[PDB]
Amino acid sequence: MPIIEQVRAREILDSRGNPTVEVEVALIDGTFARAAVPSGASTGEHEAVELRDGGDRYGGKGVQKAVQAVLDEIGPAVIGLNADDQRLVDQALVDLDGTPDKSRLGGNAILGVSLAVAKAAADSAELPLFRYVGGPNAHILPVPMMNILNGGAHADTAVDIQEFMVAPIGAPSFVEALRWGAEVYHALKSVLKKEGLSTGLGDEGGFAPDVAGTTAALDLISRAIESAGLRPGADVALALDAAATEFFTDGTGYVFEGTTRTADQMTEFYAGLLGAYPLVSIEDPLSEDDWDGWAALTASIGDRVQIVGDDIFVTNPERLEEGIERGVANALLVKVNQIGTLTETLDAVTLAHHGGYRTMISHRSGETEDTMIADLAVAIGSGQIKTGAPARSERVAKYNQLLRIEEALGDAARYAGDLAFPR
Amino acid sequence: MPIIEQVRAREILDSRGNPTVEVEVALIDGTFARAAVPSGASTGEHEAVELRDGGDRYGGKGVQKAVQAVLDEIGPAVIGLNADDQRLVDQALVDLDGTPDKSRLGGNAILGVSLAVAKAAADSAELPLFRYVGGPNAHILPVPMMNILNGGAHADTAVDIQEFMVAPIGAPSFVEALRWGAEVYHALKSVLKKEGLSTGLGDEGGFAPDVAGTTAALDLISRAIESAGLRPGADVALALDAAATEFFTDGTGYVFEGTTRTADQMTEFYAGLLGAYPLVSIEDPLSEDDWDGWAALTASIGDRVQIVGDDIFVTNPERLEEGIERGVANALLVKVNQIGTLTETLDAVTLAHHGGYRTMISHRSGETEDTMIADLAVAIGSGQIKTGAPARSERVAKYNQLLRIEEALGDAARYAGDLAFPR
């Protein structure tokens, strides 16, 4: 029977050296799962909050309090519920907390118990996690968007765009897409030296070069794609993560390249980009409060490229409906710990699917060796995933799990290449 | 293990007294599931065809050779595959047939094996058939659309619309919706008798009264809703199945009630109805091939009411993509035996979900005691179902299974009442 028997959390380190929670939900059979909770650099005004300790131990980022919360309250508050009733246990937790942010118990503890009971309600039925969460029709492997060149708010250099990404949309299978991504990565690693630059990896495995400007960055990436042995656009596309809030001074314009600009000027810059490069997707092109500018930019360049809402929505359905109404952001970005539980992620991704919006399962800055977002991007059939460059094995664990998923499917699997970027 | 061991097939009678196929896929453990294949009154030009015997036995509708196809070819052609691989087994069947409409082996000998395999890839995992096919987030109970008054191509009457339906959209739960539907049904049964009419049940349990004109029928239905104790629009809505192909003389026009009309006139009729009555959905309003007329009518009234494509699309993805891009019919009916497999069913419903189209799991004229379409309407989360009037227990078995589903969910269940008809 899939009824929870024990729950116990411990405190571990994430990929950045900061503590995080790890929950281990056992079942009355012997099914013993384990799920670690990722954590972002910060938190806006609408996400679920992490319950950090605060003080001097671990730089004020200890999670002994969330561990204690799991071990004292969340433990017996679910022991005895039905594992396969994800909508039972998740509402149980959300009411046990009682706040709109899960502040009393922290989003990290709630999410840890949610994910571990899901991994036990998939281990129980002997299904694999992607098959359980997605059913029988879970067969699509996503297009990996590999952030190879970092800039903007990361390396404090002359670049303003945050993440430059490549996407092997032309591959025949997923394993060839992973090969092409790794080859473009290792080609850029040498183009940097052949242009006198540095090879210091950021937090996603991407590079931190001191290149002139945005256009120079895209040109460097295109040179690396050509040097790999591929054809830009037909084999490998490009993508952007503008992260506009990092350079938008409220009351003034966006400060880009050393000039103050309006939303119209940024839209003109994006149109000039869409011109000379095979861009398929831009993420957070304007600030998360400039709804009118977002509608303007969506109407202007929203038929030729994907528009991802990373900050303007925080995987909250209540803001997603509003953004659907005003005609902004034809794509969502699903981060599992910005909403706090599996069920709410599934509901938000449903709501964004039935509105004409593509979704994209995404990673956090501090990840672990947990490979659940791979299974989750296969299950919901998003056809896109954003989980870093092929380096820093907290990013590569996801790609390895997707390889195993494809191998386990076999003839059933399908690579979602070029069916995920019609524009 | 979920590996098929033994497959059998026999010939049984459907709800109308015609033969049909019943398959019994067995697993190595002992999992033993049976599934009967429904069948429509006629097989069109894009469906999968049924492999009838032909001749003089059973009026030429015997299925003794679709029973033989399962026992001589399909049995060993699937024995040994993996149950949880719906994609695998369904592609195996589709290639073993080798035709664009499954004619060599019949679109009934294959669907039986598909379904009875899915009823064991869910019986094995000990999940219930609705939790398997839809995952963990399968919680939405659909709005029953009850066909209480039949007309048009069903009986000799001056009525031109095929099926008049009621929909209890204002109920708090599903069980109260079923109660309201049954009460409206009995109220109408009393009203017809009190107004000197007949109570002869059709093939769906709906009535065949000798009333004059469409408007009088909607008025009778509103009077029955009032007499039941409810209020139209706030508690119970209305719906239509025009089935207008049944009176469109090609090159002449939609001749009905003694008036030859163009596509424009039918739109005016529908606008008047939508104004004077609380309609929420009209099904097949114009014709199977009048694409331009469909685009016109969708532009005219296609945002104040639901437009269901029953015949213009045949649950075929290839025609569905065309109807999407041409902007017609923001809804479709999902009849499982017009496509041939469970897999292609899920694929078409996905393709129509991601296009802004609501779906509606529907029944056939000849059904059986098989209650699979209930489990399937709650798994895909359609939020609508069309399975006849609360009579003729081949139609009530579905409602009983939905009651059991709602009871098995518990507090997790949600009734999709009023959140399926925004217009």
Place this chain on the structure above:
Amino acid sequence: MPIIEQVRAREILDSRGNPTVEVEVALIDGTFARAAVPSGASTGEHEAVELRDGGDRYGGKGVQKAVQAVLDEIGPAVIGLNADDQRLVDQALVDLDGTPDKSRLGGNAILGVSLAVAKAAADSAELPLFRYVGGPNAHILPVPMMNILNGGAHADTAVDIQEFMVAPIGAPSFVEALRWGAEVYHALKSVLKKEGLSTGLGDEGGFAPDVAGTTAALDLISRAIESAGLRPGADVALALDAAATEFFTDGTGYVFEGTTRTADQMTEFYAGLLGAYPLVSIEDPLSEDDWDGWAALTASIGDRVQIVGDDIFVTNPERLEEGIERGVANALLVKVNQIGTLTETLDAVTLAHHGGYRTMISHRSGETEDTMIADLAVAIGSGQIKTGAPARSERVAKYNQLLRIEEALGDAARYAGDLAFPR
């Protein structure tokens, strides 16, 4: 072991849209059963009464009270008893009620538990339900008496005979008997349309057209048997359900065809019928209390035809003995919910077998998808069954179960054709 662990009831809809009880009796060794209780409208004075709610819900036909009788009282009153002791559990229930007609707990809340434990005292021994109740020698498949024409108290028509039935007594097996019945039923659907009559199905799937007198109806049936490809008498016989109580005015006489008659006149009408048509059985020829007229009728025609007591007995043994004494009809209908338990059913059928009376398992007006009476008609070896026309799959589910039974027996099965009607 076969010891009852849980019992739980719910409220579902029957084939006519009225509520009924559905009980589920789990055992310790898994063995989860369910059994729905049928319910007929025409309740007399000696049967067990149904515990309806009364009020405004469901038109006063709710059964929320009988669902409580099972969940609060009947549940623990049997939890712990032995399943294979039908006598034990059924006497337990009959004493726990304490009334001569089970009125305190309802003759529907009790029969559900009886039938469900009998379905678990066979699912336990892994025997099939027909083999358990009848032992090792349960091998006889019954002749189906298919009701194809409805008249009398059913529709506005000049006929006073209630049900006109055909019986394929000349078939080699049961499958061919079902085929011949379905073919006659589909032939009559044309002979009606080929004479300007209506095809509105009643409550048993039989037609309710406007014909002139009994003789014209029997002639239509003979024409349909001829048009099917068979020959009357040698292949298909005839049967009658004279519901003569429906036209007997106490103290005035049987008003038949518009001419007041006495018992002698009705006997003369029956004797004239026995000449021109191959009738094999008539049920309820005169009335419930007209004992003297019956003993006078079972002597004039009681040698050349079967006389079935449908209302003169209500499956009550106490009435059945006194009927055996007075030289009254030589057959009875076994309706399981007019007596209240399986045990008393078996006892009454035993008492009527040894008296030289043939039996006939029969259906109710409101049935469900429960196919128990098929197993019961095979087990007791009645050699006759009356379960409606081959339509309305609440009636066809029984025939499908009899087909499954016949192929599960194998070479052991025997069709009781023409050995059930010696006269």
Place this chain on the structure above:
Amino acid sequence: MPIIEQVRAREILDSRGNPTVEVEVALIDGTFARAAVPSGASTGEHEAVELRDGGDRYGGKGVQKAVQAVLDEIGPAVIGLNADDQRLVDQALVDLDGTPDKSRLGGNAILGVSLAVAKAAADSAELPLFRYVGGPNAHILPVPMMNILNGGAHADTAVDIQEFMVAPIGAPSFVEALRWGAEVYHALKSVLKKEGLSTGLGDEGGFAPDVAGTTAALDLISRAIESAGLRPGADVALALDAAATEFFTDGTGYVFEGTTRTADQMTEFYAGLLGAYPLVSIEDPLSEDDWDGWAALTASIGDRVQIVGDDIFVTNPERLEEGIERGVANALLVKVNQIGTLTETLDAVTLAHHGGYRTMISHRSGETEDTMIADLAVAIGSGQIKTGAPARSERVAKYNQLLRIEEALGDAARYAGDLAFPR
């Protein structure tokens, strides 16, 4: 599963010191049953034939041939069939033999395999043999007819009535009936010992002293009933086994008491006996070929007493129907080894039940420690049994098994006292 795996046969001694066959059937599911075949001396022309060895070993009564027939031919001919399919295996045996008497393989070997298969099927279902062979409604305990006074063809005495039996019809339960029978037996033993008469037990444990005549014998029995403390007729009744064939010279007449007389005078003697004594049953009152005399006697006294056909029928259905039609012998005597299988036994007892005839499971002269006929008399619900006096533990094993059956039933059991002898 209930599929036969091994069949063995050995040669043992019966209660009289003659060899007989014992068959042991081992199922594939561990079940291991053992059954021994009784054998009587007096064999007519229609019973099954016992396959004896013939020669000088064991006086020509060896059964090594039947043992070898089971071990070489029947074993593999049934190994693999389904236990619960009694009719399957029994038709298999009857065709494997190929003769109308089973003489090629002997009725004893076939019956041994049949009975051991039934015992293993009952042991498999975990039901006890009476519950299996009778179903759920097997609850009636039979009235033991105890043969206490032997005469006629058994010893040198002036009596022509073969068996004098007492029947405790007035007991409240079965255990009190057995007590009353044993007490009457010991009282008669004392009454005989007082009169210097012989106390040498026959083959049934009953005495055979040199009494004057039939009337003196019945008077001695009545004295013994009075001396026990009971009331003749109200507590204990009487019964006869005349076996008139043992004193009917064909063409001369029944030489009774030393006065040759016709059937009419024998009927007069029986009428006088019935008048002056509480006789409830007479067995074989006339010869087994004098059908007309039997009809005369049945008309004369055949409603004031039970007329048991022991030799006029040999448990053969084909002779039973002929005796039914001519109005003779309103009772049957079921000996299991005169027909050859359990299936044909059940069929003949059914045929005699549905004709107004009571049945009576009976024993043979050479019995064994096998107590199967007790279970069989409970299962078929005969309400009578004839298995000797309470002595000679091959007769008492049956009564002990009936005690255990009653104890296992418990509150469900019913003693068929005084309900089995209306007249």
